[PDB]
Amino acid sequence: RTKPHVNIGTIGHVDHGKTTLTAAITTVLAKKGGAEAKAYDQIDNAPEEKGITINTAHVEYETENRHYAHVDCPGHADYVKNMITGAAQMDGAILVVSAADGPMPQTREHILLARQVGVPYIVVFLNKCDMVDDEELLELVEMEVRELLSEYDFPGDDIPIIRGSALKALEGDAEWEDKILELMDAVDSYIPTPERDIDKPFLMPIEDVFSISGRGTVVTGRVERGIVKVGEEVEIVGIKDTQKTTVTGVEMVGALLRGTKREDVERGQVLAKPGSITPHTKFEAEVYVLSKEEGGRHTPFFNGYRPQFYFRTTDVTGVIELPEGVEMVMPGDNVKMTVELIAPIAMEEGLRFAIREGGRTVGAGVVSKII
Template sequence: MSHSSELIAGDIAGYLKAHEHKGLLRFITCGSVDDGKSTLIGRLLFESKLLFEDQLAAIEADSKKFGTQGNDIDFALLVDGLAAEREQGITIDVAYRFFSTDKRKFIVADTPGHEQYTRNMVTGASTADAAILMVDARQGILTQTRRHSFLMSLIGIRHIVVAINKMDLVDYSKARYDEIVDAYRVFAKQLGLEAITFIPMSALKGDNVVEHGHHMPWYHGPTLMAYLETIEVDEERLQRLPLRMPVQWVNRPNLDFRGFTGMISSGRVKPGDAIRVQPSGKRSTIKRIYTFDGDLEEAIAGQSVTLLLEDEIDISRGDVISGVEQPAEIADQFESTLVWMHEQPLLPGRPYLMKLGTQTLSATVTDIKYQVNVNTLEHTAAKQLDLNGIGVCTLSLSQPVAFDAYRDNQDTGGFILIDRMTNNTVGAGMLHFALRRSQNIHMQHVDIDKQARALTKNQKPAVLWLTGLSGAGKSTIANRVEKKLHAAGQHTYLLDGDNVRHGLNRDLGFTDADRVENIRRVGEVARLMVDAGLIVLTAFISPFRSERQLARDLVEDGEFIEIFVDTPLEVAEERDTKGLYKKARRGELKNFTGIDSAYEAPETPELRIDTTQLSEEEAADAIIELLRERQIIA
């Protein structure tokens, strides 16, 4: 290695060493569109001396190309990397950037300002310690300013800077600055936001970003950079909280080593400490704290470790290791606030996957108590949540979990909802408290179980779920199958779509939300009948895959048989025995499946019946044959 190479290597090593022990602050910029968020971040990168000469030359050229006036550099071009963003002059995606000063390292998320990208703002804010809320001095407090403020209050960001930008475009007016400050304080008081710092600035010109400049001598507060460098990152608060470590991995490389690996989300732990595993409630004592670099005498929040216990107790991924003095709560029903992040609306009763800590389980929003109007903070009734909707909801889980209220611990109180079919993240939420009924209702043990009931009937219980368009022939085929089973001495019951709407579901209409609830109720009834040892036949359009999957998940593997009665729409319309298609075509019947409401055909049904090829009698025989193959009947 040459002498110059050694010097360069030494400089790099020295630079890395100097930055190794600096504190790290994560913050976001948010606000309405075109208020200067990207320009501010570009300015911070420039002032931090983190740009190469070729980068400066490129953005200078781009600044002229995209229309920046005068000799000013458009620093937003450093951040808005997508072509669509540069052409429109807006930010679409969340852009993360790293920079540092002599005092601190920073990771900043530039979040989009358009309302339809509010979900991106939630993503960026989920790990932030602080937020810079940009306000255009010309526009003042806008709808998206209020929306982002409300989201910050929900997410629990403790340090907020209201950066009143583009002061150069209002002649650096102190009166305009004071007007915006007064208006925002009134709104912030409603949200309970207290730790707010107001800074007037011009991100384009550089005033009050790193240096004060000379345009606003009336402002005596800190510059933005000075404020960011002195924010107290609340790491010590996490260490003072009770111990929580969600188990990510059961580490067992050999028979002599069994540890539980995860990141400590709060508190501290050392060998000899008594712990409780939740939700099981089993207790033990910490034997060792193992890491790749050796054992630790103590581990604190933020560290990833492997805990070895004195006792052999059953622990799985998703369990939470807590201190015995202040354990987490256990429940399976909650009140929560939910931010909906998908184009398809949230429908109560529809099953989703919920990721809480390291655990993934099934969850259903059983009720939307109210939706929040972010402009007025008014609570309004809602039957569904649309994209960017924010609602307080009742959440029901498939099993009890260990949790903390989100205000106390974001790691064990924050969750996301995932669509079961597409695996897309569709919502983000915060747990508030367990519903009292979840603590008071327990499963009652009974001595006669499903197997015993089925044995007396000489059959295996099952659900035959017939799905298809209206007029496909589901009810007729199901009726023929039940007659054949009854003649053979089998014990059955037929749940028909029209029949249950005369009683159990008479209060439901045909909106998407009502269809979801219709199938949820039928699925629960079918589960009870399977538990009674019966062969249950259902004949429902059941247009959505999510709800058919819900019904499947309610029973054991092998007990759910999906039968797709496949009839082309034009054939079903020709039959139209009830005259429903004609009404739908005339606009007299809304939300009719196949006309103005979607039908999601099964992708992998256990049996597909093409009614253009098979008669109803042949279809019934095919189902009976399938039951014999699966040894449900003899």
């Protein structure tokens, strides 16, 4: 009964048909009993998720094979923040491109950002083909998309591209609805089933550290991923030198560490399966800077800026370095930056983090490269 799960969403330039396509998928699959149909205005007027406000619409649907959690956002800003903060992280993305307009810079930005934040697969719905009649023009637009995808390491020659009309399929023209079913067919067969968080190496951020007579040292947290059992040896990674310990028991999630004293463990470091995650100070990251109206910051970022980077449980100060030719980053903009932290942190590609000054959040980011 329960089907494999896949997180997806519609990326692309504004007004190329992201929200219409989302409505068309649910409306068409409702005819196969695979979804509850959602209207265009439900998805367009998206709810708010959150220390950063993001407008994200959530629809659900099923093919006969899989269950999809689908994410759609109103504006470009929401897509930058959703893909960075990982509010609803995706194992694949449906790239919507207008056949009349062709690829635009937000198409470029969403592909670059999708590659940098860890979106592993891409399917292309070439939309609004009811407005175009020249087939040579469609062939060229498709070539531009494939080359644009290859420019950012996606397999442009292998990625499925379906020409369709989200609107005409929404209004119920059966021949256009078939291109929706071919999109989902392409999604079922091209986007692989994600690995389970519990198949991955074990990882638990440390929040508190107690010492109760009769239980030694207790460490509390939330298992990010993986699984830990009784008597397993785990490493403590981040901030200090890495050290080993055995898990006496899990009490619920308080982990009793067999032979670690209380001052040898602190908030900020993580429990991990030995040799699975390592400490680092230097990394590159895709960062979004909060705009003025978001309570972020009314002055720009700059090279040498030294804010705190909140990784999982604690703040860690670090110095900022912006791309070549960039000196200031305005509020509301995003950028890729190099960061050198004061102290090492258990770090991996895809780790989210907030950027704060004192108490306030001025940015958000994803680790995209380790150094």
